[PDB]
Amino acid sequence: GPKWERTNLTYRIRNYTPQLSEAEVERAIKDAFELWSVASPLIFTGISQGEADINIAFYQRDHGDGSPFDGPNGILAHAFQPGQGIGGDAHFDAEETWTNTSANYNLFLVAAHEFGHSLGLAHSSDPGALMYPNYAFRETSNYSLPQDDIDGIQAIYG
Ligand SMILES: CNC(=O)[C@H](Cc1ccccc1)NC(=O)[C@@H](CC(=O)NO)CC(C)C
Ligand SMILES: [Ca+2]
Ligand SMILES: [Zn+2]
Numbered sequence: 001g002p003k004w005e006r007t008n009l010t011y012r013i014r015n016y017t018p019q020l021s022e023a024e025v026e027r028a029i030k031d032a033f034e035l036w037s038v039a040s041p042l043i044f045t046g047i048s049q050g051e052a053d054i055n056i057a058f059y060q061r062d063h064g065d066g067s068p069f070d071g072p073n074g075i076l077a078h079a080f081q082p083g084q085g086i087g088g089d090a091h092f093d094a095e096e097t098w099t100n101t102s103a104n105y106n107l108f109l110v111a112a113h114e115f116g117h118s119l120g121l122a123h124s125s126d127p128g129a130l131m132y133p134n135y136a137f138r139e140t141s142n143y144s145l146p147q148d149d150i151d152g153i154q155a156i157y158g
């Protein structure tokens with residue numbers, strides 16, 4: 001049963017981490033959504049101005065919700081389940097080291113986990129699953145969604 005009632009969702013990258021170029025940030029975020037798109041009927045589009053279903057941002061410590069960030073390591077990011085207002089948004093701890101390599105922490109794998117939340121998935125007990133609550137570098141190169149996450153997206157949207 002769908003958390004999101006629409007299949008064509010929009011996203012907006014609110015600010016960027018200065019640790020990567022803007023293009024590098026945009027590609028990691030896009031690659032992250034396409035992972036979920038190939039296993040479900042959902043399609044993602046970026047917008048420049050206005051209201052997006054999914055807002056993405058980099059914040060430091062207290063940022064206006066109930067979950068303040070905690071500096072380097074510890075919690076890396078958080079996301080809200082489908083809803084109105086903050087629902088669907090993904091927040092990244094600006095105090096982390098963000099990369100696009102195997103070095104901690106790879107933005108693409110962190111954003112791919114957050115987006116599962118954004119779409120309605122919960123955490124997974126399978127350590128090989130992207131929805132697992134502990135970060136692990138897997139690869140990036142020919143990374144495709146693990147089996148457990150396909151089962152989880154398919155169970156909600158077909
Ligand atoms: C190096 N840090 C971690 O692996 C911590 C470990 C942890 C787990 C529970 C409580 C505190 C810390 N995990 C997270 O930051 C996760 C928080 C979360 O689930 N967002 O949606 C996100 C990763 C899976 C990408
Ligand atoms: Ca942190
Ligand atoms: Zn937040």
Ligand SMILES: [Zn+2]
Nearest residue numbers: 113117123133
């Ligand atoms: Zn999570």
